[PDB]
Coordinates of all heavy atoms in Angstrom, one line a residue:
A1 N 84.2 114.2 312.6 CA 85.6 114.2 312.7 C 86.1 115.6 312.9 O 87.0 115.9 313.7 CB 86.3 113.5 311.5
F2 N 85.6 116.5 312.1 CA 86.0 117.9 312.1 C 85.7 118.4 313.5 O 86.6 119.0 314.2 CB 85.2 118.7 311.1 CG 85.3 120.2 311.3 CD1 86.6 120.9 311.2 CD2 84.2 120.9 311.6 CE1 86.6 122.3 311.4 CE2 84.3 122.3 311.9 CZ 85.5 123.0 311.7
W3 N 84.5 118.3 314.0 CA 84.0 118.9 315.2 C 84.5 118.3 316.4 O 84.9 119.1 317.4 CB 82.4 118.8 315.3 CG 81.7 119.7 314.4 CD1 80.9 119.3 313.4 CD2 81.7 121.1 314.5 NE1 80.4 120.4 312.8 CE2 80.8 121.5 313.4 CE3 82.2 122.0 315.3 CZ2 80.6 122.9 313.2 CZ3 81.9 123.4 315.1 CH2 81.1 123.8 314.1
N4 N 84.7 117.0 316.5 CA 85.1 116.2 317.7 C 86.6 116.0 317.8 O 87.1 115.9 318.9 CB 84.4 114.9 317.8 CG 82.9 115.1 318.0 OD1 82.4 116.2 318.5 ND2 82.1 114.1 317.6
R5 N 87.3 115.8 316.6 CA 88.8 115.5 316.6 C 89.6 116.7 316.2 O 90.5 117.1 317.0 CB 89.1 114.3 315.7 CG 88.2 113.1 315.9 CD 88.5 112.3 317.1 NE 89.5 111.3 316.8 CZ 89.3 110.2 316.2 NH1 88.0 110.0 315.8 NH2 90.2 109.3 315.9
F6 N 89.3 117.3 315.1 CA 90.2 118.3 314.6 C 90.0 119.7 315.2 O 91.0 120.3 315.7 CB 90.1 118.5 313.0 CG 90.9 119.6 312.5 CD1 92.2 119.4 312.3 CD2 90.4 120.8 312.3 CE1 93.0 120.4 311.8 CE2 91.2 121.9 311.9 CZ 92.5 121.6 311.6
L7 N 88.8 120.3 315.1 CA 88.5 121.6 315.7 C 89.2 122.0 317.0 O 89.7 123.0 317.1 CB 87.0 122.0 315.7 CG 86.7 123.4 316.2 CD1 87.4 124.3 315.2 CD2 85.2 123.7 316.3
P8 N 89.1 121.0 318.0 CA 89.8 121.4 319.2 C 91.3 121.6 319.1 O 91.8 122.6 319.7 CB 89.5 120.2 320.2 CG 88.2 119.7 319.6 CD 88.4 119.8 318.2
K9 N 92.0 120.8 318.3 CA 93.4 121.0 318.2 C 93.7 122.3 317.6 O 94.7 122.9 317.8 CB 94.0 119.9 317.3 CG 94.1 118.5 317.9 CD 94.1 117.4 316.9 CE 94.4 116.0 317.5 NZ 95.8 116.0 318.1
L10 N 92.8 122.8 316.8 CA 92.8 124.2 316.2 C 92.5 125.3 317.2 O 93.4 126.1 317.4 CB 91.9 124.2 315.0 CG 91.5 125.6 314.5 CD1 92.7 126.2 313.7 CD2 90.3 125.6 313.6
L11 N 91.3 125.3 317.7 CA 90.9 126.3 318.7 C 92.0 126.5 319.8 O 92.3 127.6 320.3 CB 89.6 126.0 319.3 CG 88.5 126.2 318.3 CD1 87.1 125.8 318.9 CD2 88.4 127.7 317.9
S12 N 92.6 125.4 320.2 CA 93.7 125.4 321.2 C 94.8 126.3 320.7 O 95.3 127.1 321.5 CB 94.2 124.0 321.4 OG 95.4 123.9 322.1
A13 N 95.2 126.1 319.5 CA 96.3 126.9 318.9 C 95.9 128.3 318.7 O 96.7 129.2 319.1 CB 96.8 126.3 317.6
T14 N 94.7 128.6 318.2 CA 94.3 130.0 318.1 C 94.1 130.7 319.4 O 94.1 131.9 319.5 CB 92.9 130.1 317.3 OG1 91.9 129.7 318.2 CG2 92.9 129.1 316.1
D15 N 93.9 129.8 320.5 CA 93.9 130.4 321.8 C 95.3 130.8 322.3 O 95.4 131.8 322.8 CB 93.3 129.3 322.8 CG 91.8 129.4 322.8 OD1 91.2 129.7 321.9 OD2 91.3 129.1 324.0
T16 N 96.3 130.0 322.0 CA 97.6 130.4 322.4 C 98.3 131.3 321.3 O 99.5 131.7 321.4 CB 98.6 129.1 322.7 OG1 99.3 128.8 321.5 CG2 97.7 128.0 323.2
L17 N 97.5 131.7 320.4 CA 97.9 132.7 319.3 C 97.2 134.0 319.6 O 97.7 135.1 319.3 CB 97.5 132.2 317.9 CG 98.4 132.7 316.7 CD1 98.1 131.8 315.5 CD2 98.1 134.2 316.4
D18 N 96.0 134.0 320.2 CA 95.3 135.2 320.6 C 95.8 135.7 321.9 O 95.5 136.8 322.4 CB 93.8 135.0 320.6 CG 93.2 135.4 319.3 OD1 93.7 136.4 318.7 OD2 92.1 134.8 318.9
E19 N 96.7 134.9 322.6 CA 97.4 135.3 323.8 C 98.7 135.9 323.4 O 99.2 136.7 324.2 CB 97.6 134.1 324.7 CG 96.9 134.1 326.0 CD 97.5 135.1 327.0 OE1 98.6 135.5 326.9 OE2 96.7 135.6 327.9
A20 N 99.2 135.5 322.2 CA 100.5 136.0 321.8 C 100.4 137.2 320.9 O 101.4 138.0 320.7 CB 101.2 134.9 321.1
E21 N 99.2 137.4 320.3 CA 99.0 138.7 319.6 C 98.5 139.8 320.6 O 98.6 140.9 320.2 CB 97.9 138.5 318.5 CG 98.4 138.4 317.1 CD 97.4 138.4 316.0 OE1 96.5 137.5 316.1 OE2 97.3 139.3 315.2
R22 N 98.2 139.4 321.8 CA 97.8 140.2 322.9 C 99.1 140.8 323.6 O 99.2 142.0 323.9 CB 96.9 139.6 323.8 CG 96.2 140.5 324.8 CD 95.0 139.7 325.4 NE 94.1 139.3 324.5 CZ 93.4 138.1 324.6 NH1 93.5 137.3 325.6 NH2 92.5 137.8 323.6
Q23 N 100.1 140.0 323.7 CA 101.4 140.3 324.3 C 102.2 141.2 323.3 O 103.1 141.9 323.7 CB 102.2 139.1 324.7 CG 102.5 138.9 326.2 CD 103.5 137.8 326.5 OE1 103.2 136.7 326.4 NE2 104.7 138.2 326.9
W24 N 101.8 141.1 322.0 CA 102.5 141.9 321.0 C 102.0 143.3 320.8 O 102.7 144.2 320.4 CB 102.5 141.2 319.6 CG 103.4 139.9 319.5 CD1 104.5 139.7 320.3 CD2 103.3 138.9 318.6 NE1 105.1 138.5 319.9 CE2 104.3 138.0 318.8 CE3 102.4 138.6 317.5 CZ2 104.5 136.8 318.1 CZ3 102.6 137.4 316.8 CH2 103.6 136.5 317.1
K25 N 100.8 143.6 321.2 CA 100.2 144.9 321.2 C 100.5 145.7 322.5 O 100.6 146.9 322.5 CB 98.7 144.9 321.0 CG 97.9 144.5 322.2 CD 97.2 145.7 322.8 CE 95.9 146.1 322.0 NZ 95.1 147.2 322.7
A26 N 100.7 144.9 323.6 CA 101.1 145.5 324.9 C 102.6 145.9 324.7 O 103.0 146.9 325.3 CB 100.9 144.5 326.0
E27 N 103.4 145.1 324.0 CA 104.8 145.3 323.8 C 105.1 146.3 322.7 O 106.2 146.8 322.5 CB 105.5 144.0 323.5 CG 107.1 144.0 323.7 CD 107.7 142.6 323.6 OE1 107.0 141.7 323.3 OE2 108.9 142.6 323.8

């Protein structure tokens, strides 16, 4: 359940968070 259902909903968010912490160091 963790691996197949939950983890992706997480990684997805940390992906759009590591894109937003990248725009914050450029800015």
